[PDB]
Enzyme design. Structure first.
Site, short mmCIF file in Angstrom:
data_model
loop_
_atom_site.label_atom_id
_atom_site.label_comp_id
_atom_site.label_asym_id
_atom_site.label_seq_id
_atom_site.Cartn_x
_atom_site.Cartn_y
_atom_site.Cartn_z
N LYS A 63 -2.09 -2.84 -9.85
CA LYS A 63 -2.97 -3.90 -9.74
C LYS A 63 -2.01 -3.96 -8.07
N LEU A 64 -0.76 -4.33 -8.29
CA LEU A 64 -0.36 -4.92 -7.41
C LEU A 64 -0.26 -4.67 -6.12
N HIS A 65 0.37 -2.57 -6.21
CA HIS A 65 -0.04 -2.29 -4.85
C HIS A 65 -1.61 -2.24 -4.44
N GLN A 66 -2.36 -2.21 -5.04
CA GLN A 66 -3.97 -2.55 -4.00
C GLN A 66 -4.07 -3.74 -4.44
N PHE A 82 1.62 -2.43 -11.88
CA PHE A 82 2.27 -1.81 -10.64
C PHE A 82 1.11 -1.93 -9.82
#
Length: 189
Positions: A29-32, A27
């Site tokens: 890594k996806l938000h970054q 999550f």
RNA sequence: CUAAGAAAUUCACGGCGGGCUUGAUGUCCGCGUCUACCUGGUUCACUGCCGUGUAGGCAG
């Protein structure tokens, strides 16, 4: 109802991190590496969710757009750590589309933040606001609201989600720059 | 259907005077503790600027 472009994410079981730890890493890594340059269409619901056993996340399901996944999965903010989990696949949207409006929002969790707000811009009694924090005062997500937190505060992850009602209806809304819904989301099924 | 049955039982007080326990002493000799290890324990199922009514975007 509007989960046309569908995808999944399965973090494999390994002794190098927990399933909640792997979900929080995915999550973050996806938000970054998804809302880094911005974007509009990002839907991240629980594709293997079960909110009855108190476990907020143990599987990932993405219900996003075509161009939002053709350019939102080819960066180093998403790749690199693909040795635990795996990649995804595209799937069409069927006729069965429940209006599960998944969101990315917050909840009430401050047991002394009202005292800080009254001291800053309220002019309230800070002693009564500090002593008015009982166990029956906090009203947060008692269901599985998985809070993938960072290494800044020692307090554990509380609820941070905007879940919707699972029925046979339709409810879609505007996606933010973090993979959520601001009034509804795509389907789940 | 208890080896059934039942009971006010007491008020008062000056312990105290005195004393030399002391003399002497070799605890000794010897010894292998060693093998292996994931503390992510969550160090309160939590601390924070919008109105001190569940009403917000961060390397939480």
């Amino acid at each position: 109802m509007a989960m046309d472009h569908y995808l999944d994410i399965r973090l494999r079981p390994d002794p190098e991190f927990p399933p909640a730890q792997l979900m929080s890493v995915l999550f973050g890594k996806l938000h970054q590496a998804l809302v880094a340059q911005g974007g509009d269409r990002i839907g991240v619901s629980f594709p293997d969710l079960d909110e009855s056993r108190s476990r907020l996340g143990e599987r990932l399901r993405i219900h996003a757009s075509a161009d939002d996944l053709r350019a939102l999965l080819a960066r180093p903010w998403l790749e690199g750590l693909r040795d635990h989990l795996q990649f995804g696949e595209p799937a069409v949207v069927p006729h069965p589309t429940p209006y599960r409006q998944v969101s990315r929002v917050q909840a009430k969790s401050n047991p002394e933040r009202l005292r800080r707000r009254l001291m800053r811009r309220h002019d309230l009694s800070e002693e009564e606001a500090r002593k008015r924090i009982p166990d029956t005062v906090a009203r947060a997500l008692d269901l599985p609201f998985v809070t993938l937190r960072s290494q800044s505060t020692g307090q554990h992850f509380r609820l941070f989600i905007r879940h919707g009602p699972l029925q046979v209806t339709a409810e879609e809304g505007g996606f933010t720059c973090y993979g959520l819904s601001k009034g509804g989301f795509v389907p789940w099924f």
